[PDB]
Design a protein around this ligand. Structure first.
Ligand code: CLA
Ligand code: CLA
Ligand code: CLA
Ligand code: CLA
Ligand code: CLA
Ligand code: CLA
Ligand code: CLA
Ligand SMILES: CC1=C(C#C/C(C)=C/C=C/C(C)=C/C=C/C=C(C)/C=C/C=C(\C)C#CC2=C(C)C[C@@H](O)CC2(C)C)C(C)(C)C[C@H](O)C1
Ligand SMILES: CC1=C(C#C/C(C)=C/C=C/C(C)=C/C=C/C=C(C)/C=C/C=C(C)/C=C/C2=C(C)CCCC2(C)C)C(C)(C)C[C@H](O)C1
Ligand SMILES: CC1=C(C#C/C(C)=C/C=C/C(C)=C/C=C/C=C(C)/C=C/C=C(C)/C=C/C2=C(C)CCCC2(C)C)C(C)(C)C[C@H](O)C1
Ligand SMILES: CC1=CCCC(C)(C)[C@H]1/C=C/C(C)=C/C=C/C(C)=C/C=C/C=C(C)/C=C/C=C(C)/C=C/C1=C(C)CCCC1(C)C
Lengths: 37, 170, 120, 74, 65, 37, 39, 503, 192
């Protein structure tokens, strides 16, 4: 299969960057909830 | 109540009648929208330009200076925009008009009369009565020359005949 | 591939049961969007400006989270009064009915074109 | 009145002069939250739910950061 | 809170928040110019659409030269 | 110029975390077969 | 003036006198006749 | 707290921080412009402008530099094909570096405005709260826009104090940056008249300038102030998104259909030049008047420039690419090397057959050789059995005229079929498929990609305009509805909807 | 009002049995009480009569115009236009510019005299509608002569507008100019 090579970077980083963004937004929020108590 | 110049129209308010040649003629009513002194200065300046232009139009036709070539008045502008003189004249007019700007700023604050520059080099109209008659004569002749310069030039365009020529042969 | 071969051999698009299924799914989307829009539009104010409106509803609460009267009146003015479902239970029965009946009909249409009773 | 006066270039906008200051605060979200009285049936139902244990194990559920934070500070 | 030279220079340009002319103001001429601009947009749209063929206006690549 | 009164916290509850992770992973699944070509 | 330009100007005139002006006049008359109370 | 989709609303009522975020966005956009220019220059091949122009190499942002003056490089080459001896600073490289520097400066300004936010400029003297006098700020911005528009029209585009703009002939063969005099009158509204650009940018600019003087001077009416929520900045956001998607649709249309502001040698031809045979007709009339001058087919076709023959080719069509066929146009068919000439198809007797051309709609089109009147004469059959119009039965020969394959008369059926397949795609060319490892599937030119992107952005920004107009007009009920709604929404309670003075 | 209650005025009624319009009282001249389609309610009788009077004036000039232009073409104008009459003349005149100069000068009169006077009357000026001041011969000084005169200017002018129309319409239908049209009265033996 003559597939593209930057498509690996495209798929992997376009999955990674939003995923880490969501994980950071969740962890930040939880930390803040724990710190409030 | 009603302007003598335009009887069906009402008298324009700011045109009380003090200024020379004021016959209550302001149908569109610019005086109501802008300072009358600025408009009077513009009138006098344009009209003085036009009086000089009307005289020079004929004086050039009868007599063009020998050091310069003979061109009908309108054909000359294009000549001297290259000869060099055109620049000199328009240059000096700008120089005087900078002090004209300063005088206009005085006019806005009311420290100077409209169309007044104390030019009585030879004390012609030094009489109060005469200066009035002269002020009336000046504004009329200016208002006439505004029409005359436009006619002269526009006639050359539609008919290649310096006014003196055209009048001679219609 | 199965779609294209089915259309080639049976003309499912012209078969009226598939058209009922298309009506079912399109109407399901229409009524889903409409019902969600009207419930979200008439949410009772229970939330501050720096807070998501969804937190105005507490799980297991007894009171309604939105004004049925406001949504009903808005939809009545939108089309005409008689069209609106003033009853909520009838509304939700209709919501459950339209797509279920549409998909029943299109499933039955495929079942009948299995035995080669084709579209028009 | 005149043509130029009619447009009232001089009078600010043709109809515009002496402008007032608008009072309404256009960037203002209403905040009149409504209180719903607790019925007797509601008290019975929450009593059963608390006996079963529905009010424990996740005290922050259904609450925003700000709401739960202000609650935890009482 | 902070006062600066440019802030002082530009303060008159941000000192009339909420100042409104009373009544309808200039809305009639606003609507008239709206009508005129609508007509202009319609004219140019129909020109390129070639529903409004104007003499000496050849809407084509060949008009370039 | 001192503390900003417009500072606000930001949150992402766990349900929203799972929704976002699911959206990103499914978009990756859908568009990977088109990026590789 | 090309035929297309004449057609365009005529279309504007008929849009005025067949759609805009009739609807506006009807709205004005009906709004002035059937008036709300206690406004 | 503030959910992830409301996070940028904290800066709604903080004008200094709003200027900061606008500055950061501007910095990022300028940095993108510079970086894209640098990458394009890194991957650009300026050797061959006639068979490997900018638009064949996937050059998206460089044509916009070349459109309004920047046609030279510090490396001693020009997009027009000439060799530059003494390039100025404002080359492609200089423009890129200037954009990067502006990005850095805008970033620093964003940092300063983010830190120093509490300025007295943003605080209302009457109330002391942070505020923006949006109607007057608009007048100031409209003054600036009018001044810039008039300056661009009067100095840059006319070349009085600028380079001018890109102007080209009818067929994209001889194009260059040059001044354009303003076309006052109806001819300025021809979209394919470049002069109409100057006439626009002067006149419109003047009106914009005058409009600025109005909006700084004249306060809004109270009626429009309360109706449009002029004290709410989200009104400005909604109206700006509205105007922005309007402009996006207009630019999309002028890109796809073409105009004087989208030259073909900067963005490739349009689909409609292929559909109408725009270049085929020109080549045909050129060779026809050459034949009328006494020349023969070989000489007549040899006078056709390679660039014009290159335009008459379906691979250059923007309507042949694909959504996920990514990269330069050279990544598809290949890098064009040479033109093999016109393949006249002399049938067995000597009649001139012609291969029917592929329409853009069809991914694969049958090879049929229609007659002069067009009855099908020969074709490449799918089913060979019981074949009537096979080239074997009819008998066809390919005589090449012009190009590198000039004066060659192939008369075997196989070699006739091979060039019938090529003639199906318009003019026949030689391609290098090894430099970029091309895969033989057509791509879209920058014209098509611009059209795609900006059409989608225009639709999405229509959605955004709807959303923000809804928000600014429904600010009071943002968090939800109160108890007042129940009384007014009853049928017949009030004579007029909403108003409660009625009944 | 000349013969108020006799030829003009309240008592009179163009369509008797039908009430005098609500806004058509006595003062306006030429009020026989005829506003069948009730424009009076929606329109400013001021603008109304500015128009009626103006029209009737341009219509009289125009009617006489056509009638004279068919007896005595000024020779120079005649030679340039080659005997063209009515519409065709307008087409050729618009070429020699005759009609272009006329447009410029009448429009200049309007922008100088007509428009500002309209703004004033419609807002309190005592310059009653159509009352530009034009009495060079001061033909009427009597408060009486002048009423008869205003009524006659309105009415002679209405015949004017009806007839300009007829002359033009007849000219389109049949070739002849108005002096020509009465002669060859059937006018259908040759469209001309
Ligand atoms: C109103 C403005 C005006 C303008 C724009 C011009 C422009 C020109 N004039 Mg001048 N001219 C003017 C007024 C003006 N004139 C007046 C008032 C007179 C009457 C004395 C003349 C008499 C005059 C003559 C006799 C000649 C020109 C000529 C010229 C040309 C060269 C300048 C020169 O020699 O001036 C000289 C003029 C003066 C010093 C008189 C002006 C003094 C007042 C205070 C201004 C140039 C086209 C020459 C030309 O056309 O050559 C081809 C030429 O031969 N002009
Ligand atoms: C005292 C100041 C001054 C100076 C230094 C000059 C200098 C010059 N003028 Mg003159 N000029 C002056 C006042 C002056 N002007 C004034 C007050 C006016 C009227 C506003 C003019 C109007 C004028 C004209 C119309 C022309 C000159 C020209 C000239 C040139 C004359 C030299 C030559 O060829 O012999 C030179 C550039 C001539 C020129 O430019 O030739 C190339 C020319 O045609 N001048
Ligand atoms: C004499 C002076 C002068 C001259 C010569 C021109 C010349 C021009 N103007 Mg104009 N213009 C002038 C003065 C002048 N202008 C002034 C004083 C102003 C006021 C500031 C304007 C304002 C103005 C605007 C706002 C526009 C022009 C445009 C144009 C161009 C028209 C040809 C073209 O390519 O249209 C191509 C564009 C059109 C024909 C406009 C299409 C309009 C429709 C209604 C858009 C519909 C969009 C809608 C959302 C789509 C929905 C459906 C879709 C999704 C399927 C041309 C360069 C147009 C332009 O920029 O073109 C590139 C344009 O849009 N001018
Ligand atoms: C609207 C603006 C625009 C336009 C019209 C173009 C046009 C072009 N660019 Mg691009 N480009 C842009 C913006 C734009 N660019 C930006 C902002 C960047 C910076 C990142 C680049 C960076 C860039 C590079 C580095 C290159 C190009 C190149 C090209 C050319 C080929 C396009 C292509 O193959 O697309 C292919 C597009 C796709 C395969 C996807 C399109 C379909 C949609 C949008 C996908 C959406 C997926 C969605 C987000 C979900 C993902 C989920 C995730 C979890 C995986 C063409 C001339 C090439 C060229 O020839 O350069 C010389 C090239 O090498 N561009
Ligand atoms: C320049 C135009 C513009 C501006 C200034 C704003 C500004 C705003 N919008 Mg947005 N909006 C726009 C266009 C714009 N919008 C458009 C075109 C749409 C239609 C899709 C929307 C739809 C929209 C909605 C539905 C909502 C907003 C909201 C908001 C507010 C908060 C958004 C936020 O914090 O996002 C934070 C965003 C993120 C943390 C991540 C977003 C990632 C995106 C989806 C993908 C990657 C984008 C990429 C990097 C860059 C795009 C390039 C560009 C050329 C398109 C804010 C006032 C919210 C609001 O009103 O709150 C009160 C809200 O709910 N907007
Ligand atoms: C070309 C310039 C010009 C201008 C500025 C006006 C201006 C006016 N005309 Mg018009 N009018 C013009 C030429 C012009 N007219 C010409 C050449 C004629 C025929 C000779 C008329 C005949 C005419 C009539 C009969 C009437 C107007 C009326 C009007 C007014 C509303 C339009 C306004 C004062 C109306 C008016 O003033 O009464 C309300 C009106 O009834 N005009
Ligand atoms: C035979 C018809 C006729 C009659 C009876 C009158 C009657 C009158 N005209 Mg005249 N008038 C007429 C035709 C007539 N006009 C025509 C054809 C024109 C157009 C050139 C005018 C233009 C005209 C003007 C401009 C004025 C009069 C005025 C008058 C009044 C003073 C005389 C008087 C009511 C004056 C007026 O209105 O005073 C109240 C006045 O100023 N008339
Ligand atoms: C009532 C009224 C109004 C009005 C009005 C109306 C309808 C007014 C109509 C006015 C008319 C009909 C005016 C005609 C003027 C003709 C002139 C000056 C001819 C010039 C000829 C020349 C120079 C010549 C020539 C020649 C040349 C050069 C070349 C030769 O080979 C030929 C030739 C010899 C022919 C308005 C609308 C304002 C409203 C207002 O409320 C009052
Ligand atoms: C272009 C150009 C050049 C130039 C130039 C120059 C010097 C141009 C100058 C043009 C001028 C001065 C034109 C004046 C026009 C006046 C008009 C129409 C007045 C009408 C008044 C009327 C009808 C009055 C009416 C009236 C009123 C209101 C009140 C009283 C009654 C009535 C009399 C009826 C060059 C030669 C330098 C060459 C260069 O390459 C470019
Ligand atoms: C110059 C030019 C052209 C032109 C032109 C021109 C000059 C056109 C002029 C057109 C005019 C003046 C039309 C008038 C029509 C009047 C009508 C129908 C009146 C009916 C009245 C009735 C029924 C009254 C009835 C009544 C009567 C009797 C008794 C009392 C009750 C009452 C209801 C009042 C073109 C178009 C050819 C183009 C060319 O290139 C250039
Ligand atoms: C994900 C996705 C969605 C839709 C579109 C698309 C498919 C293309 C894709 C991509 C989208 C987007 C928005 C991509 C945009 C990329 C951007 C904005 C990249 C940014 C580039 C900016 C750069 C280098 C800036 C360089 C700046 C530098 C050195 C500054 C340095 C300096 C500083 C800081 C101080 C002064 C001195 C100096 C040296 C100038």
């Amino acid at each position: 299969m003559n597939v593209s090579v930057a498509a690996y970077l495209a798929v992997l980083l376009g999955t990674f960057v939003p995923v880490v963004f969501l994980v950071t937004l969740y962890i930040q929020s939880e930390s803040r909830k724990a710190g409030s108590s | 109540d009603f302007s003598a110049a335009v009887p069906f129209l009402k008298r324009p308010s700011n045109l009380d009648g003090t200024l020379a040649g004021d016959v209550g003629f302001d149908p569109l009513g610019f005086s109501d929208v802008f300072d009358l002194r600025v408009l009077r200065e513009a009138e006098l300046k344009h009209g003085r330009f036009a009086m000089l232009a009307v005289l020079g139009f004929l004086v050039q036709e009868v007599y063009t200076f020998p050091f310069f070539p003979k061109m009908a008045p309108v054909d000359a502008h294009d000549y001297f925009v290259t000869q060099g003189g055109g620049s000199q004249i328009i240059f000096w007019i700008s120089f005087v008009e900078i002090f004209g700007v300063v005088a206009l700023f005085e006019l806005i604050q009311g420290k100077r009369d409209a169309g007044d520059f104390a030019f009585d080099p030879l004390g012609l109209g030094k009489d109060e009565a005469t200066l009035a008659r002269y002020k009336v004569a000046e504004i009329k002749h200016a208002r006439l020359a505004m029409i005359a310069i436009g006619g002269f030039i526009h006639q050359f365009w539609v008919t290649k005949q310096t006014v003196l020529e055209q009048l001679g042969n219609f | 591939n199965f779609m294209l071969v089915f259309q080639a051999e049976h003309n499912i698009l012209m078969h009226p049961f598939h058209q009922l299924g298309v009506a079912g799914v399109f109407g399901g989307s229409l009524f889903s969007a409409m019902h969600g829009s009207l419930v979200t539009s008439s949410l009772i104010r229970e939330t501050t400006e720096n807070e998501s409106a969804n937190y105005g509803y507490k799980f297991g609460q007894e009171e309604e989270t939105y004004n049925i009267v406001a949504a009903h009146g808005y939809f009545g003015r939108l089309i005409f009064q008689y069209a609106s479902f003033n009853n909520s239970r009838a509304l939700h029965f209709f919501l459950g009915l339209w797509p279920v009946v549409g998909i029943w009909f299109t499933a039955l249409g495929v079942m009948t074109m299995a035995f080669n009773l084709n579209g028009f | 009145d005149t043509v130029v006066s009619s447009l009232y270039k001089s009078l600010g906008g043709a109809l515009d002069k002496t402008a007032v200051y608008d009072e309404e605060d256009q960037l203002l979200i209403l905040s009149d939250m409504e209180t719903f009285p607790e019925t007797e049936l509601g008290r019975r139902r929450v009593a059963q739910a608390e006996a079963a244990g529905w009010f424990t194990g996740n005290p922050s559920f259904g609450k925003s950061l700000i709401e739960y934070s202000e609650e935890t500070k009482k | 809170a902070l006062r600066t030279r440019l802030g002082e220079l530009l303060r008159p340009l941000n000192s009339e928040y909420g100042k409104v002319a009373p009544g309808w103001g200039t809305t009639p001429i606003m609507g008239f110019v709206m009508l005129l601009f609508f007509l202009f947009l319609l004219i140019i749209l129909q020109i390129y659409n070639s529903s409004l063929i104007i003499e000496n206006v050849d809407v084509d690549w060949a008009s370039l030269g | 110029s001192g503390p900003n009164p417009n500072k606000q916290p930001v949150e992402l509850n766990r349900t929203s975390l799972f929704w976002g992770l699911l959206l990103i992973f499914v978009l990756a699944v859908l568009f990977s077969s088109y990026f590789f070509n | 003036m090309t035929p297309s330009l004449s057609a365009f100007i005529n279309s504007l005139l008929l849009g005025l006198f067949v759609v805009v002006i009739p609807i506006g006049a009807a709205l004005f008359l009906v709004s002035q006749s059937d008036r709300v109370t206690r406004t | 707290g503030l959910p992830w989709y409301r996070v940028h609303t904290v800066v709604l009522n903080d004008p200094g921080r709003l200027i900061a975020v606008h500055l950061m966005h501007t910095a990022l956009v300028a940095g993108w412009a510079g970086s894209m220019a640098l990458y394009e220059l890194a991957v650009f091949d300026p050797s061959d402008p006639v068979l490997n122009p900018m638009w064949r190499q996937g050059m998206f942002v460089m044509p916009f530099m070349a459109r309004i003056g920047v046609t030279d490089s510090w490396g001693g080459w020009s997009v027009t094909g000439e060799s530059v001896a003494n390039p100025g600073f404002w080359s492609f490289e200089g423009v890129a570096l200037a954009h990067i520097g502006l990005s850095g400066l805008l970033f620093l300004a964003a940092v300063w405005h983010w830190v120093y936010w509490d300025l007295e400029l943003f605080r209302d003297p009457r109330t002391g709260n942070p505020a923006l006098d949006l109607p007057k700020i608009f007048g100031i911005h409209l003054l600036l826009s009018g001044v810039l528009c008039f300056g661009f029209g009067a100095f840059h585009v006319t070349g009085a104090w600028g380079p001018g703009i890109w102007v080209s002939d009818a067929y994209g063969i001889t194009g260059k940056v040059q001044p354009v005099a303003p076309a006052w009158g109806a001819e300025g509204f021809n979209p394919f008249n470049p002069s109409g650009v100057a006439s626009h940018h002067i006149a419109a600019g003047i009106l914009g300038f005058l409009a600025g003087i109005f909006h700084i001077a004249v306060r809004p009416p109270q009626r429009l102030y309360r109706a449009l929520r002029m004290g709410n900045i989200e009104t400005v956001l909604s109206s700006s998104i509205a105007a922005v998607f309007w402009s996006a649709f207009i630019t999309t249309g002028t890109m796809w259909y073409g105009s004087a502001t989208t030259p073909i040698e900067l963005f490739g031809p349009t689909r409609y030049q292929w559909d109408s045979g725009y270049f085929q007709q020109e080549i045909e009339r050129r060779v026809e008047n050459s034949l009328n001058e006494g020349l023969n087919l070989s000489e007549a076709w040899s006078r056709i420039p390679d660039k014009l023959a290159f335009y008459d080719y379906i691979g250059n069509n923007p309507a042949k690419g694909g959504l996920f066929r990514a990269g330069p146009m050279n990544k598809g068919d290949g890098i064009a090397e040479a033109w093999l000439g016109h393949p006249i198809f002399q049938d067995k007797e000597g009649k001139e057959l012609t291969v029917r051309r592929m329409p853009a709609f069809f991914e694969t089109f049958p090879v049929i050789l229609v007659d002069k009147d067009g009855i099908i004469r020969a074709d490449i059959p799918f089913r060979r059995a019981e074949s009537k119009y096979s080239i074997e039965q009819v008998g066809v020969t390919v005589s090449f005229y012009g190009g590198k394959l000039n004066g060659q008369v192939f008369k075997d059926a196989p070699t006739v079929k091979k060039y019938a397949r090529k003639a199906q795609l318009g003019e026949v060319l030689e391609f290098d498929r090894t430099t970029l490892e091309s895969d033989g599937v057509f791509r879209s030119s920058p014209r098509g990609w611009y059209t795609f992107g900006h059409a989608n952005f225009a639709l999405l920004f229509f959605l955004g305009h709807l959303w923000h107009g809804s928000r600014t007009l429904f600010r009071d009920v943002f968090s939800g509805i109160g108890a007042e709604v129940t009384e007014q929404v009853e049928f017949g309670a009030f004579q007029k909807l909403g108003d409660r003075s009625t009944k | 009002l000349y013969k108020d209650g006799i030829i003009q005025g309240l008592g009179v009624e163009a369509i008797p049995g039908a009430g005098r319009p609500a806004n058509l009282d006595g003062t306006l001249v030429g009020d026989v009480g005829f506003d069948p389609l009730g424009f009076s309610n929606w329109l400013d009788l001021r603008w109304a009569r500015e128009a009626e009077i103006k029209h009737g004036r341009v219509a009289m000039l125009a009617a006489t115009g056509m009638i004279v232009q068919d007896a005595y073409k000024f020779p120079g104008f005649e030679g340039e236009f080659g005997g063209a009459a009515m519409m065709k003349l307008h087409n050729l005149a618009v070429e020699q510019g005759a009609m272009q100069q006329l447009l410029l000068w009448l429009g200049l009169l309007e922008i100088i005299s007509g428009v500002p006077a309209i703004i004033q009357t419609l807002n309190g000026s005592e310059r009653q509608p159509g009352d530009f001041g034009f009495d060079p011969l001061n033909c009427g000084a009597n408060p009486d002569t002048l009423a008869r005169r205003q009524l006659t200017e309105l009415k002679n002018g209405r015949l004017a507008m009806i007839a300009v129309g007829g002359m033009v319409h007849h000219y389109l239908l049949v070739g002849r100019g108005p002096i020509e049209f009465i002669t060859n009265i059937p006018n259908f033996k040759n469209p001309l």
